[PDB]
Amino acid sequence: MQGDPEVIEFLNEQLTAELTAINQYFLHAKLQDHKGWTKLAKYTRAESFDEMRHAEVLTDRILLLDGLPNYQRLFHVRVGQSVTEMFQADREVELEAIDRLRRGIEVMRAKHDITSANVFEAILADEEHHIDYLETQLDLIEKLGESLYLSTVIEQTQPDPS
Amino acid sequence: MQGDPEVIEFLNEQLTAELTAINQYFLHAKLQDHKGWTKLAKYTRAESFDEMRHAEVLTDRILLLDGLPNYQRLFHVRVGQSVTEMFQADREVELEAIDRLRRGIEVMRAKHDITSANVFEAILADEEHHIDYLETQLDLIEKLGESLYLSTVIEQTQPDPS
Amino acid sequence: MQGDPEVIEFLNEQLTAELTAINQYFLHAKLQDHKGWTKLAKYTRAESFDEMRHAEVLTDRILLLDGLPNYQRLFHVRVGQSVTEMFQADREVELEAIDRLRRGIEVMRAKHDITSANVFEAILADEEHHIDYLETQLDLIEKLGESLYLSTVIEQTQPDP
Amino acid sequence: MQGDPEVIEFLNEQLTAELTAINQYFLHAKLQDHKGWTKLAKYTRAESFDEMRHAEVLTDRILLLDGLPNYQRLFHVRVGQSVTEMFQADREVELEAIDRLRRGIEVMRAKHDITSANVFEAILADEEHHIDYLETQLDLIEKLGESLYLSTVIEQTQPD
Amino acid sequence: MQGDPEVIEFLNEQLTAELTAINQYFLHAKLQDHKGWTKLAKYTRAESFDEMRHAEVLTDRILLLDGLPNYQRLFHVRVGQSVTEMFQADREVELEAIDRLRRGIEVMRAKHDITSANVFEAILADEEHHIDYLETQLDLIEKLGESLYLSTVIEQTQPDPS
Amino acid sequence: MQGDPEVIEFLNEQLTAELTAINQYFLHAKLQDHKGWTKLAKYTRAESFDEMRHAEVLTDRILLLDGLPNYQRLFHVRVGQSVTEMFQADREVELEAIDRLRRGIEVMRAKHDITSANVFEAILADEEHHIDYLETQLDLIEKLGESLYLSTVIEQT
Ligand SMILES: [Fe+2]
Ligand SMILES: [Fe+2]
Ligand SMILES: [Fe+2]
Ligand SMILES: [Fe+2]
Ligand SMILES: [Fe+2]
Ligand SMILES: [Fe+2]
Ligand SMILES: [Fe+2]
Numbered sequence A, B, E: 001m002q003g004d005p006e007v008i009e010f011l012n013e014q015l016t017a018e019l020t021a022i023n024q025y026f027l028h029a030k031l032q033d034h035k036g037w038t039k040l041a042k043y044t045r046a047e048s049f050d051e052m053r054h055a056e057v058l059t060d061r062i063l064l065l066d067g068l069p070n071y072q073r074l075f076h077v078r079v080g081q082s083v084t085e086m087f088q089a090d091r092e093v094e095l096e097a098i099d100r101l102r103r104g105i106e107v108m109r110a111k112h113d114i115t116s117a118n119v120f121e122a123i124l125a126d127e128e129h130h131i132d133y134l135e136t137q138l139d140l141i142e143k144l145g146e147s148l149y150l151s152t153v154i155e156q157t158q159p160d161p162s
Numbered sequence C: 001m002q003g004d005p006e007v008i009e010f011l012n013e014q015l016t017a018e019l020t021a022i023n024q025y026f027l028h029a030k031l032q033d034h035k036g037w038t039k040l041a042k043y044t045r046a047e048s049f050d051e052m053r054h055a056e057v058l059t060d061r062i063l064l065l066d067g068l069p070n071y072q073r074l075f076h077v078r079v080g081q082s083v084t085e086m087f088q089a090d091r092e093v094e095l096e097a098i099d100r101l102r103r104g105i106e107v108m109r110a111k112h113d114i115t116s117a118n119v120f121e122a123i124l125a126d127e128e129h130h131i132d133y134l135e136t137q138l139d140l141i142e143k144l145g146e147s148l149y150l151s152t153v154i155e156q157t158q159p160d161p
Numbered sequence D: 001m002q003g004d005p006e007v008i009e010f011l012n013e014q015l016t017a018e019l020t021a022i023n024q025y026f027l028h029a030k031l032q033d034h035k036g037w038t039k040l041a042k043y044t045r046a047e048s049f050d051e052m053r054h055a056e057v058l059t060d061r062i063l064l065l066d067g068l069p070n071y072q073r074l075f076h077v078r079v080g081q082s083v084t085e086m087f088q089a090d091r092e093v094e095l096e097a098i099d100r101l102r103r104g105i106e107v108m109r110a111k112h113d114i115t116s117a118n119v120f121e122a123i124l125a126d127e128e129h130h131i132d133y134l135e136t137q138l139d140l141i142e143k144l145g146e147s148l149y150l151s152t153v154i155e156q157t158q159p160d
Numbered sequence F: 001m002q003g004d005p006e007v008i009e010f011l012n013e014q015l016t017a018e019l020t021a022i023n024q025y026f027l028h029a030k031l032q033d034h035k036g037w038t039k040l041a042k043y044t045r046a047e048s049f050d051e052m053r054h055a056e057v058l059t060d061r062i063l064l065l066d067g068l069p070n071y072q073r074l075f076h077v078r079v080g081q082s083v084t085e086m087f088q089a090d091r092e093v094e095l096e097a098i099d100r101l102r103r104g105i106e107v108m109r110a111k112h113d114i115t116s117a118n119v120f121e122a123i124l125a126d127e128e129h130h131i132d133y134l135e136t137q138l139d140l141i142e143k144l145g146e147s148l149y150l151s152t153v154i155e156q157t
């Protein structure tokens, strides 16, 4: 039971993209946390955890196919100062991810392999949901005003009592 | 046993510093309470209690060595009318405390003492966290605007543990 | 709606006296705790906390009338070695407190003000109770002696039961 | 409040080495779980999570000093097929980490810094404990024999 | 990993001192209980258990660093009759421990190892606390009087139900 | 009340032997725990605690007789690197202990003391039980083998 080499390379590329997503999301979460912004930090921390779960399932599937996952390669990492650059870079990486997912799902369904294809469209759906969230928040910050919007994520108003 | 005068005088100076910090922070919390701003008052109250604990432990340490803790003399306590200048004053007294503590801990580690060096380390860490929070707060208020930021604290607390 | 000066410096001076009292009481409690006299330390700590509540409410009232609280100045703080001198110092402090509080309460009661007078009889009642306790303690120490009283108060902090 | 270049660069190097260690531990854990050595898999997962928390505290400290942490560059990672070589790779990365750590702690204590010195002290202690575990396990495996140890570590109690 | 025998011999000295201290305190606790003196016996029991824990940490550290823990060497064990000389002997034992631990901590921190330095710091703090207790109780028994002091600890009852 | 010198000497020798056993058991327990043989370490700590309680009751009895216990002096302590040598060391120290116990029992019984006889009987029974356990482990290891015996006791939790 050996998979095709193109299947292995597609899984490896997706795994590399997931690792880059993990690193970028964690570094961002730390940046917003240091800036003091709380809700953004916790939401992106949850997003990073979800990406780690995706990496888990992908590496299990590729390991079952009798392959050697490569944990050495990593794509480029982008950092900015304001929230707009955060959202723009995240949108870019998710867009390239969706393109790769669509190509991979098409070819995988073409070349008689399904379970890998199934986890492919699962990751596809999750990432398209994340893109929708990112796009709607980008629109909201564009319309609302940067300072006025950021007045929302930060609040010290005794949240402990409940 | 009995301690050499250097450690005793450094501990007494530190005691004076934390007494000044306690008085300054309590007055800041009370004045913040009068102007209706709520959360800042409770945060500063917690800081005041932390400084009270620091003074208590330092007094215990100095009294262990058969010294004479001084409570007669204080430093110059200063007051502000708006948020910016009291934040600045807290930062100033904090920087002075950090520099003096670093010098004393170095010279007193050089003269055979660790336990009091350890308590100085603890005070250093707590004061460093306090100054980092102060600096982040100052940057946020300068970026966002005094009025808009002040709008975020006045009400809508709702402490209901039950 | 702000009050006249005479009331405000009366309150500010009373606050300074309270701050000196809390510092002296805390120092005495810490010393007696180190020496091994535990129950005395507990009582002195309770007294110090009550005096701190006094200071807090009194400065709240000072701020109420659009005042300018000052924390810079302090009265004299005295220290002792045996229980006798500590108790005597506390007695002198309390005597000055009651005298000055009475003069202040009457002088501003004669000037169409009530709430500050009210907090003043509250403080005065507390100080009268405290001076009563210190007086009876000193009298009992005189009646019995020194070593026996310490034997009564001293306890072994075993912390193993 | 800004820190010196030497301390921040030491922090960055340690963070990078630790991230590589996290990745390596996770990889070995997954391969151990694949072949049925479940107990080793649990142990490796616990160690990887501990390294994750250590990296989190390290990046918090470096970001405290108006630093710029890097998650881009990594060091080389190695993999193994049997227990002996993977254990040896673990031990050697631990040794290099502790050596760099001792040099850094001495330099920083000379350069008037305390909090970072304390956190490197804690990390040094934990890596000392972990290297002790690795060495004792390697010696036990050597004495006992590979087949018997593998028979010991097997679970085979999968519910379905 | 291997150790330079300086730290090994310092740890062995501390180990032997701890063992002899354990024996001394255990004997003194038994004797005070025989005299009917209860609370002193309980406190000595607790501090003897503390010293045993210290010895356990010491031997754990010496075994970790690839040492050979020697338990054959024992220092001098001395006894008394009244409370005064028992307290005095405890005081001098603590003083010797403080001095030896001081020399060891300085010389070994001058040798690029700090973990055993940290455990030495903890032990030093504990011993300073214990010697402070010894000094204060000796001073109070001197001032108060011996028989009147012993009247405070004696109690006439059956074996206390724990 | 006043005891006889010979029974006091026997009690002191017993106390010294118990202290030596405490030392050897604790050191052996730590050595075995450092190598991952968990269950043996746990049992050895249990035996050490038993020896401590035995030493404490012996101290109580010897102190009852208006005598002075001995703590400065202790017997020789022996350590090994494999399981067999420590097992034999425990066996031989227990053998010499049981011999001295029997002799002291006879002499002090002839010297009219009674409660000491009972406490020596209790310690005798416990030491005999420990000897039984040691011999059973020894011949089990001998017949079965070093490797498999070490394998069946490691935990790695
Ligand atoms: Fe994660
Ligand atoms: Fe994904
Ligand atoms: Fe402070
Ligand atoms: Fe308070
Ligand atoms: Fe008062
Ligand atoms: Fe690491
Ligand atoms: Fe014990």
Ligand SMILES: [Fe+2]
Residues within 6 Å of the ligand: E018, E051, E054, E123, E126, E127
């Ligand atoms: Fe100790």
Ligand SMILES: [Fe+2]
Residues within 6 Å of the ligand: F018, F021, F051, F054, F123, F127
């Ligand atoms: Fe025994």
